[PDB]
Design a binder for this molecule. Structure first.
Ligand SMILES: CC(C)(COP(=O)(O)OP(=O)(O)OC[C@H]1O[C@@H](n2cnc3c(N)ncnc32)[C@H](O)[C@@H]1OP(=O)(O)O)[C@@H](O)C(=O)NCCC(=O)NCCS
Length: 564
């Protein structure tokens, strides 16, 4: 059973990439056609002639010519019977306690097809994107694997829908936050239902904005709509009964991009006071903590909740400050945990795109990331560990590899390459860490592969040291147990005595300095050289520019030597 499977995806998004890894690592072939136009979708099917079509992320209706000829299954992010384009938005706005995902056949009527598989799950009070990347994605994987087994068996019949309901596209009027009428729980519900797109509209300091990444505040109080404080570029705003933090906003304009709230509001905030809390402080009320440092059982854990895993220059230096603090503490190990949804996606391309000089801001940002990496590497007397609870891409992968040990949750998707951002050389000391893990020949192959790999595949090729756990919480518990056991063994003390000798030696310090110098000379060429492919790629990415064809790295059926 080696199936030829065509994906129909609006973008090759997180769910599409996860399914690509699950199917190809089971020796199926997956070609992708991006959802650009029905004419191109029909052509892709006739070119590739798939055994099965899966649509992980659909914007347009699939043409009848296609799904009447090829068995075509659609992912719907609601339980059986739920129909409509905004299933998760409604489940969050209505406060559903149970939700689910359905794999159904394409049909003439919208979302009316017979059910191949479904999964249900309890809802969290959390952003839509977090539900999509965790509960929905895990359930969809189980559905698709079940359906492939059923498809190959050959006598399967799907289950017609019985009860069903329709929810239309959700209008912004429903999402709009009114500070005087809305209590904190209502503001959170609206922002969660609209994050990461399209955003919940509001007015803040007279500016029409879209709100993203909200957190409740229990200490600061004021008038509704009043800005109460700034913290790490997030703003705290009074609600009907309390206050909420908004970390990111977008102006309500076609060309504007998502940015830290302080950068969107700008001079309108003049006079607001910063209300800082250090990551290592303890507080007994709910508040916004971008970076959190906690110690348990001789292990110092650093959580860094950078929105979308994107690490701005200033976020990197706040992470650096926390790592330096941890290195002065009486812990045996330091664990970098990222956030539940992302370990890291490297430099923050949005704050780079927004800068007066994107090239200069890129230079600032890569030097700040390398300072984090260098601080991690130069830790002679403590174990360092990267715990990847969620996805990582580009420099975010190589940030993890600077740690002594890298572990990841099952189902994490890695993109250890720069092919989507103009072929940057990369830094983060990859020219030291990567050959140490996989060898030079394999390391070059890894960085030449533009397709994603799972954490299981990363473990199998030696890129990371272990993979375990199904949820972020299970992964964190198992990681803590594994590290606790290690640091309480004689093996740890022998390892640290070796590490102390290696990492204070002149030869090693010269080696990693030469690695940083060489990588940054190449990145300087990427950022400032006459060839501006990096800047063009960043613009297309950050501005979400549309596609007019599917590139052959995705579309096997559009490659030069393709036939049959
Ligand atoms: C890693 C990657 C392939 C994952 O693809 P994916 O699973 O489909 O996830 P998405 O592209 O949808 O990312 C989710 C969100 O994070 C944003 N994002 C991801 N990486 C980002 C980055 N480095 N900077 C700014 N935003 C980033 C995306 O724009 C998207 O934003 P939105 O939901 O608010 O609209 C893709 O996000 C990517 O190429 N990121 C850039 C990594 C990079 O090039 N960094 C700079 C060089 S170090």
């Amino acid at each position: 059973s080696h199936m030829r499977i065509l994906f129909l995806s609006y973008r090759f998004n997180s769910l599409s990439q996860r399914l690509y890894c699950e199917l190809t690592e089971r020796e199926h072939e997956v070609s992708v056609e991006l959802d650009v136009h029905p004419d191109l979708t029909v052509e892709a099917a006739e070119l590739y002639k798939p055994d099965l079509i899966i649509a992980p992320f659909l914007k347009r209706k699939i043409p009848q010519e296609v799904w009447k000829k090829y068995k075509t299954l659609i992912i719907h992010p609601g339980p059986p019977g739920d129909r409509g384009p905004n299933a998760l938005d409604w489940a969050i706005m209505k406060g559903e306690r149970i939700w689910g995902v359905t794999l159904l056949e394409a049909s003439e009527e919208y979302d009316a097809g017979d059910v191949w598989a479904y999964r249900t799950f309890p809802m969290r009070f959390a952003r839509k994107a977090s539900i999509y990347r965790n509960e929905v994605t895990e359930g969809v994987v189980e559905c698709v694997l079940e359906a492939l087994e059923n498809f190959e068996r050959g006598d399967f019949k799907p289950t017609p829908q019985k009860e069903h309901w329709w929810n239309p596209k959700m209008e912004q009027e429903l999402r709009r936050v009114d500070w005087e009428q809305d209590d904190t729980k209502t503001v959170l519900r609206k922002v969660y239902a609209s994050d990461s797109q399209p955003g919940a509209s509001s007015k803040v300091l007279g500016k029409e904005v879209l709100l993203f990444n909200a957190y409740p505040e229990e200490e600061l109080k004021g008038k509704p709509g009043e800005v109460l404080a700034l913290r790490d570029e997030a703003v705290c705003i009074g609600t009907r009964d309390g206050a909420v933090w908004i970390t990111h906003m977008r102006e309500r304009k076609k060309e504007s991009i998502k940015l830290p709230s302080a950068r969107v509001l700008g001079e309108f905030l003049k006079g607001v006071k910063e209300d800082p809390i250090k990551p290592w402080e303890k507080v007994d009320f709910k508040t916004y903590r971008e970076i959190l440092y906690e110690e348990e059982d001789g292990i110092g854990f650093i959580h860094f909740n950078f929105y979308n895993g994107a690490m701005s220059t200033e976020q990197c230096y706040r992470l650096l400050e926390t790592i330096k603090y941890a290195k002065k503490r009486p812990v045996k190990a330091i664990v970098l945990l990222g956030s539940e949804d992302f370990f890291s996606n490297g430099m923050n391309l949005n704050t780079i795109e927004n800068a007066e000089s994107p090239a200069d801001e890129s230079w600032r940002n890569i030097n700040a990331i390398d300072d984090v990496c260098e601080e991690i590497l130069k830790t002679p007397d403590k174990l360092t560990v990267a715990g990847m609870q969620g996805n990582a891409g580009a420099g975010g992968v190589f940030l993890a590899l600077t740690c002594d040990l890298v572990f990841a949750r099952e189902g994490v998707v890695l993109n250890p390459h720069y092919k989507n951002i103009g072929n940057l050389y990369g830094s983060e000391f990859w020219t030291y860490t990567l050959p140490k893990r996989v060898g030079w020949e394999k390391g070059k192959e890894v960085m030449e592969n533009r397709m994603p790999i799972s954490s299981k595949k990363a473990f199998e090729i030696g890129l990371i040291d272990g993979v375990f756990g199904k949820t972020p919480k299970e992964f964190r518990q198992r990681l803590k147990e594994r590290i606790k056991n290690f640091i309480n063994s004689k093996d740890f003390y022998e390892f640290i005595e070796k590490k102390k000798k290696e990492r204070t030696s002149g030869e090693w310090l010269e080696e990693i300095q030469k690695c940083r110098e060489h990588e940054l000379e190449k990145m300087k060429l990427n950022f400032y050289g006459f060839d501006t492919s990096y800047h063009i790629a960043r613009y297309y990415f950050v501005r979400r520019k549309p596609h007019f064809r599917t590139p052959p790295y995705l579309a096997i059926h559009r490659r030069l030597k393709f036939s049959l």
